[PDB]
Ligand binder design. Structure first.
Ligand SMILES: CN(C)Cc1cc(/C=N/c2cc(Cl)cc(C(=O)NC(C)(C)CO)c2)ccc1O
Lengths: 156, 39
């Protein structure tokens, strides 16, 4: 199949035509997406298959073919870059200074960019091009805009 | 059934479009992984 590093779409033919349910990161031969995108289901790559390895509904994260490999963290200061892969549309880098989710269990970065649900699993990048987390778990604000948590995992 | 397509490389792009705000939000995180606005 395909094992190359990079950003991928996640597609299904279970609905009308070919529908994009979300997006993920291939790194070190491991595929990273958000639990809500696949609900832990197996994935096809050519005639290659990808089985789930790790997943957590509360982290809203899942890895395939190996443990979670992305460790980089938002510094709390710098503009990041999202890599939006919207349905039917080319990958596009959007620059934004994150906001914060204040939780009863510590602070996490947040990104106030409007994209449709299928963009879920689109990655967020620091200035060295490291994936500091994944975009598409979050909350609707007064405005009616979207603000994703910056979701990230732990590397063993 | 679900399949993946390489949609691009992962790089920082010098002069990307720059947009959005940076709001500070009080939220909860439930057992189901749902974030909600605390006020
Ligand atoms: C534990 N739950 C909460 C995980 C979960 C997540 C989602 C995805 N939610 C999104 C993700 C994005 Cl990237 C965007 C949007 C959106 O609505 N954006 C707009 C601009 C407003 C367009 O309408 C929603 C879906 C079902 C689920 O269970």
């Amino acid at each position: 199949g395909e094992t190359t590093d990079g950003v991928y779409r996640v597609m299904t033919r279970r609905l009308l035509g070919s529908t994009q349910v979300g997006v993920g990161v291939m790194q070190e031969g491991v595929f990273h997406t958000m639990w809500h995108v696949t609900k832990g289901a197996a994935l096809r790559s050519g005639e290659g298959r990808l089985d789930p390895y790790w997943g957590d509904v509360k982290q809203d994260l899942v890895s395939y073919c190996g443990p979670w490999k992305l460790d980089a963290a938002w510094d709390g200061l710098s503009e990041v870059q999202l890599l939006a892969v919207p349905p039917g549309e080319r990958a596009k880098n959007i620059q934004t200074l994150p906001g914060i989710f204040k939780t009863k269990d510590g602070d996490i970065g947040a990104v106030a960019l409007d994209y449709p649900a299928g963009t879920s699993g689109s990655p967020i990048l620091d200035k060295c091009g490291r994936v500091i987390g994944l975009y598409g778990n979050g909350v609707v604000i007064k405005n009616g805009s979207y603000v994703s948590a910056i979701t990230q995992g732990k590397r063993e | 059934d679900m399949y993946i397509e390489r949609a691009g490389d992962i790089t920082w792009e010098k002069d990307a479009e720059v947009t959005g705000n940076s709001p500070r939000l009080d939220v909860a995180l439930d057992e189901s992984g749902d974030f909600s606005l605390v006020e």
